[PDB]
């Protein structure tokens, strides 16, 4: 009975991720001193992860366990659209964090007058609008999923769509994240004190470390899938074994559950907020 225990393992992971992301959101919502434009981006990332883990992953696990779609064609389209939207929003909201930290490190003295709350929320809105355009846009212009059997839930088999989605949703934001974090790394390796003060320099070098951990885990989890799927859709004969191609799929979606572990195990204020929220 491989189905039941696999489903139980997956469900445990999804519930763990759901609680982790709710806890991350509450730790920032319920704390006055944690309300900063750079923490609202963490809350946005947690919101995308929470949507993915509470609305998308349960049905993905059921669909893996069963092996077919048991909820009709109408819910297939909605589930696929929400999945793609949340996945694109998560990575673009990580890219916006990369840009925010690059600005806060390169120009630590003008940062309060560059990244204002107005501009920070404008950036959030632009990220979400861009995610909607990149994700839900192509799903209509590239033959919204074709299957005609009411049990198949197959996003566009077209090679063009997978190229655009892979490029737009993984490889364009990854370039910005990696470039911006490298500059943060290079700057932090040359400057004695970032903002002339030791407390500020410490509090800026700690956040950069946490960002590096988040980015490293994200790349590690999501790179195998985006290396193995596009090649499969580009060279038809280079189809890998399904066992490894199932592992890379769930490895990528495990990030939405791991990230709330990254946040408190790297920072000391996030851990305290986690305790203060769990105790209540």
């Amino acid at each position: 009975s491989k189905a039941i225990l696999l489903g139980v393992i997956l469900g445990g992971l999804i519930l763990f991720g759901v609680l982790g992301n709710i806890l991350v959101i509450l730790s920032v919502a319920c704390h006055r001193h944690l309300h900063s434009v750079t923490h609202y981006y963490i809350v946005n990332l947690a919101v995308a992860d929470l949507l993915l883990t509470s609305t998308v992953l349960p049905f993905s696990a059921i669909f893996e366990v069963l092996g077919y779609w048991a909820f009709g064609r109408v819910f297939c389209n909605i589930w696929a659209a929400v999945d793609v939207l949340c996945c694109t929003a998560r990575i673009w909201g990580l890219c916006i964090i990369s840009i925010d930290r690059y600005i806060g490190v390169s120009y630590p003295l003008r940062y309060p007058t560059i990244v204002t709350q107005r501009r920070g929320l404008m950036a959030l809105l632009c990220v979400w609008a861009l995610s909607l355009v990149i994700s839900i846009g192509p799903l209509f212009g590239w033959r919204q999923p074709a299957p005609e059997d009411e049990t198949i839930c197959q996003i566009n088999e077209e090679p063009g769509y997978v190229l655009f989605s892979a490029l737009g949703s993984f490889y364009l934001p990854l370039a910005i994240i990696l470039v911006m974090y490298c500059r943060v790394y290079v700057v932090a390796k040359r400057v004695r004190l970032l903002s002339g003060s030791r407390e500020k320099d410490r509090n800026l070098r700690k956040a950069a470390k946490t960002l590096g951990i988040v980015v490293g885990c994200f790349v590690l989890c999501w790179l195998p899938f985006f290396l193995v799927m596009p090649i499969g859709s580009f060279f038809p004969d280079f189809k890998p074994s399904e066992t490894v191609f199932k592992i890379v799929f769930w490895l990528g979606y495990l990030n939405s559950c791991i990230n709330p572990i990254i946040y408190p195990c790297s920072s000391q204020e996030f851990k305290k907020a986690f305790q203060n929220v769990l105790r209540i």
Epitope: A188, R192, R202, R205, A208, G212
Partner: nanobody, 111 residues
Framework: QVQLQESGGGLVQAGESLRLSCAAS????????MGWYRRELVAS???????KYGDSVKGRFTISRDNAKNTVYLQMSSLKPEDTAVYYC???????????????WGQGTQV
Amino acid sequence: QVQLQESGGGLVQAGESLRLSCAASGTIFRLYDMGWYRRELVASITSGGSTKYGDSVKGRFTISRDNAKNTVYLQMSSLKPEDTAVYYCNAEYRTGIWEELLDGWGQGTQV
């Protein structure tokens, strides 16, 4: 725990020169500002090469730093009867790229 200790001590009468040594030992990611103190500042070098001296030093001293082997030196010149109380070794070190800047002192020397 990074360690910096004095060196080059001894006994001599006025008119002769010395060369104290001080190098960093331990887990260091890099060193930023190094120099000697007498409490009072007598010299200091930054990682770039900007040399500084105290007002009491009328170009008397020459503090030198090697970027390769994490070592500093201080060449003495023209001892004075009332210019030797204690000589410390002060450095600011970082043990990692994502850690706070710290500093350490030395034991001391006298002549």
